[PDB]
Amino acid sequence: MIVAEIQKNSLKEQRIKFIRNHQQAFDVEPIYPLRLFEDFVMSVEGDCSIEASCKIELDKLIASRFMLFFKDQEWEKYLTQSLAFFRQVENRVGVQLDYSLLQKFLGHNFDFSKLEVLSAGLDLRTNLADSSLKIHIRIKDYPEKINQALSLTIDGDDLTAVRDFLSVVGFDFYFDGRSAIEIYPEVKKEDFFKPKTQEKVWQHLPKFVLEPLQVTNLFGFGFSNPVVYYRLKGRQDLTNYFKINDTAQRVHSFYQHQDILPNMWVGTTQKELEKTRIENIRLYYYKSFKM
């Protein structure tokens, strides 16, 4: 035994621990696709974060999701590593995914320098056909591709009003071969009090939607009763600003203790926040793994 020789694969161990603590804590099945995601996370050499989330509807945990956030900027490599993970899900789970929307968005002339964030992973639902692989992308100052995403999405025209707010393109690849592309408009904290935000975003939203912004550094919304996303600064303020039910509380309490990143995401709809208690919510937590 030599302590310096045990250090090779040390970072690999906490990443597995984080994945399996969540699959054990919330009964995530089937386990096999989670193993391939675990192999995918093992092959990442540099810095990363893993995002772990649960979708809660009424008294039910209906979905668990894991995304790996790449931290350096070797974007082409990461997409290749992501696609290799997708092939392994196809081959060994035994499904065929639809890559057309991703191929149409990329084309054969994508400018990878315009990328800011790349993450890839999988959403597990108890009905295997409703489970999916995902890629979430953030580009900056690439209106050609923003416009292309708009064309490929369904009802892209609604988002033209907020075009300067578009930055996140997401891709869904469902195990039964369905697929989807989506753009998500966002507002940074530092833009909360700029008349453009007020005219194009804040004006169209009720008071009860706007109130958690007090404690939010990044806001996402999606007019498609909209969907809203709050990146809360600290994990303590979820129950201060959201009326969550009992099984969502347990999810939050599990991660409340843990030594994870402070920021978290809440995702809901405006109508859910109009209610007196939230019944449909997704909670997102993050752990960092730096070299």
Spans of all domains in the chain: 1-291
Residue 245: both structure tokens together: 């039910």
Say if residues 62 and 37 touch (Cβ distance below 8 Å): no
Q: Dump strand ranges (E) for the chain.
A: 48-57, 60-70, 115-125, 132-139, 166-174, 179-188, 216-222, 227-232, 264-269, 280-289
What is the distance between the alpha carbons of residues 60 and 254, in angstroms, rounded to a whole number? 16
Say if residues 26 and 64 touch (Cβ distance below 8 Å): yes
User: What is the torsion angle, in degrees rounded to the nearest 10, for the CA atoms of residue 220, residue 135, residue 48 and residue 263?
Assistant: 20
Q: Which of 177, 133, 171 is nearest to 153 (CA)?
A: 171
Output DSSP code: residue 94.
Answer: I
Output DSSP code: residue 159.
Answer: G
HEC sequence for 183-194? EEEEEEHHHCCC
Which of 251-257's residues contact partners 24+ apart within 8 Å by CB, and which partners? 251/26, 251/54, 251/56, 251/61, 251/283, 252/283, 254/25, 254/26, 255/52, 255/283, 255/285
User: Who's near 105: CB < 8 A, 6+ residues apart?
Assistant: 145, 148, 149, 152, 169, 171, 181
* Amino acid (one-letter) located at 215: V
Rg (CA), the chain: 19
Residue 94: both structure tokens together: 């035994």
Say if residues 179 and 152 touch (Cβ distance below 8 Å): no
Q: Check whether the bond before 30 is cis (ω within 30° of 0).
A: yes
Output DSSP code: residue 275.
Answer: S
What is the distance between the alpha carbons of residues 126 and 103, in angstroms, rounded to a whole number? 29
What is the distance between the alpha carbons of residues 175 and 90, in angstroms, rounded to a whole number? 8
- Residue 183: phi, psi to the nearest 5? -105, 145
Report CA-CA distances (Å) from 171 to 65, 71, 128: 14, 20, 18
